[PDB]
Symmetry: C2
Subunit: 57 residues, 2 copies
Protein backbone atom coordinates (compact mmCIF):
# COMPACT_ATOMS: atom_id res chain seq x y z
CA UNK A 1 0.00 0.00 0.00
CA UNK A 2 2.87 2.35 -0.85
CA UNK A 3 2.08 5.53 -2.78
CA UNK A 4 4.70 7.53 -4.68
CA UNK A 5 4.10 10.74 -6.63
CA UNK A 6 6.73 12.53 -8.71
CA UNK A 7 6.22 16.12 -9.87
CA UNK A 8 8.24 17.78 -12.63
CA UNK A 9 8.31 21.55 -12.14
CA UNK A 10 10.51 24.27 -13.65
CA UNK A 11 12.16 25.40 -10.42
CA UNK A 12 12.38 24.08 -6.87
CA UNK A 13 10.03 26.82 -5.68
CA UNK A 14 7.41 25.59 -8.14
CA UNK A 15 7.64 21.93 -7.11
CA UNK A 16 7.74 22.93 -3.44
CA UNK A 17 4.34 24.60 -3.83
CA UNK A 18 2.92 21.29 -5.04
CA UNK A 19 4.59 19.19 -2.34
CA UNK A 20 2.92 21.29 0.36
CA UNK A 21 -0.51 20.34 -0.97
CA UNK A 22 0.37 16.69 -1.56
CA UNK A 23 1.46 16.49 2.08
CA UNK A 24 -1.99 17.53 3.29
CA UNK A 25 -3.80 15.21 0.88
CA UNK A 26 -1.64 12.31 2.07
CA UNK A 27 -2.00 13.21 5.75
CA UNK A 28 -5.78 13.50 5.50
CA UNK A 29 -5.75 10.15 3.69
CA UNK A 30 -3.97 8.50 6.60
CA UNK A 31 -0.64 8.43 4.77
CA UNK A 32 1.09 10.35 7.57
CA UNK A 33 4.88 10.21 7.77
CA UNK A 34 5.68 11.17 4.18
CA UNK A 35 9.22 11.24 2.80
CA UNK A 36 10.36 13.50 -0.04
CA UNK A 37 13.36 12.62 -2.21
CA UNK A 38 14.78 15.01 -4.81
CA UNK A 39 17.51 14.19 -7.32
CA UNK A 40 18.80 16.89 -9.65
CA UNK A 41 15.65 18.84 -10.49
CA UNK A 42 12.86 16.35 -9.78
CA UNK A 43 11.01 15.84 -6.50
CA UNK A 44 9.16 12.64 -5.60
CA UNK A 45 6.96 12.16 -2.54
CA UNK A 46 6.77 8.77 -0.81
CA UNK A 47 3.97 7.85 1.57
CA UNK A 48 2.71 4.71 3.29
CA UNK A 49 -0.70 3.74 4.67
CA UNK A 50 -1.22 1.65 7.80
CA UNK A 51 -4.69 0.48 6.81
CA UNK A 52 -5.72 0.07 3.19
CA UNK A 53 -5.50 -2.85 0.78
CA UNK A 54 -7.36 -4.26 -2.23
CA UNK A 55 -7.75 -7.90 -1.21
CA UNK A 56 -9.06 -10.24 -3.91
CA UNK A 57 -8.84 -13.93 -4.79
CA UNK B 1 5.08 26.95 -17.46
CA UNK B 2 4.00 23.35 -18.04
CA UNK B 3 3.33 21.30 -14.90
CA UNK B 4 3.13 17.50 -15.05
CA UNK B 5 2.65 15.10 -12.15
CA UNK B 6 2.93 11.31 -12.41
CA UNK B 7 1.48 9.09 -9.69
CA UNK B 8 2.31 5.40 -9.27
CA UNK B 9 -0.42 3.44 -7.49
CA UNK B 10 -1.13 -0.28 -7.10
CA UNK B 11 -4.49 -0.31 -8.87
CA UNK B 12 -6.21 2.08 -11.29
CA UNK B 13 -8.83 2.87 -8.65
CA UNK B 14 -6.04 3.97 -6.31
CA UNK B 15 -4.40 6.34 -8.78
CA UNK B 16 -7.79 7.67 -9.89
CA UNK B 17 -8.56 8.63 -6.29
CA UNK B 18 -5.46 10.84 -6.34
CA UNK B 19 -6.11 12.29 -9.79
CA UNK B 20 -9.43 13.71 -8.60
CA UNK B 21 -7.61 15.73 -5.94
CA UNK B 22 -4.78 16.86 -8.22
CA UNK B 23 -7.40 18.17 -10.64
CA UNK B 24 -8.96 20.35 -7.93
CA UNK B 25 -5.57 21.69 -6.85
CA UNK B 26 -4.61 22.51 -10.44
CA UNK B 27 -7.93 24.26 -11.10
CA UNK B 28 -7.66 26.38 -7.95
CA UNK B 29 -4.07 27.15 -8.95
CA UNK B 30 -5.19 28.48 -12.32
CA UNK B 31 -4.05 25.42 -14.25
CA UNK B 32 -7.56 24.76 -15.54
CA UNK B 33 -7.97 22.44 -18.53
CA UNK B 34 -5.88 19.50 -17.34
CA UNK B 35 -5.12 16.45 -19.49
CA UNK B 36 -4.48 12.98 -18.07
CA UNK B 37 -2.45 10.39 -19.98
CA UNK B 38 -2.22 6.77 -18.86
CA UNK B 39 0.05 4.13 -20.39
CA UNK B 40 -0.02 0.56 -19.13
CA UNK B 41 -0.43 1.04 -15.38
CA UNK B 42 0.84 4.58 -14.80
CA UNK B 43 -1.21 7.78 -14.75
CA UNK B 44 0.32 11.21 -15.36
CA UNK B 45 -1.51 14.54 -15.18
CA UNK B 46 -0.58 17.37 -17.53
CA UNK B 47 -1.53 20.98 -16.88
CA UNK B 48 -0.68 24.42 -18.23
CA UNK B 49 -0.53 27.97 -16.87
CA UNK B 50 -1.61 31.22 -18.53
CA UNK B 51 0.59 33.45 -16.40
CA UNK B 52 0.09 34.49 -12.79
CA UNK B 53 -1.77 37.80 -12.92
CA UNK B 54 -4.33 38.89 -10.32
CA UNK B 55 -7.31 39.50 -12.60
CA UNK B 56 -10.81 38.11 -12.04
CA UNK B 57 -14.30 37.72 -13.49
Amino acid sequence: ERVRISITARTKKEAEKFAAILIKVFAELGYNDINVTWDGDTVTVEGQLEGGSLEHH
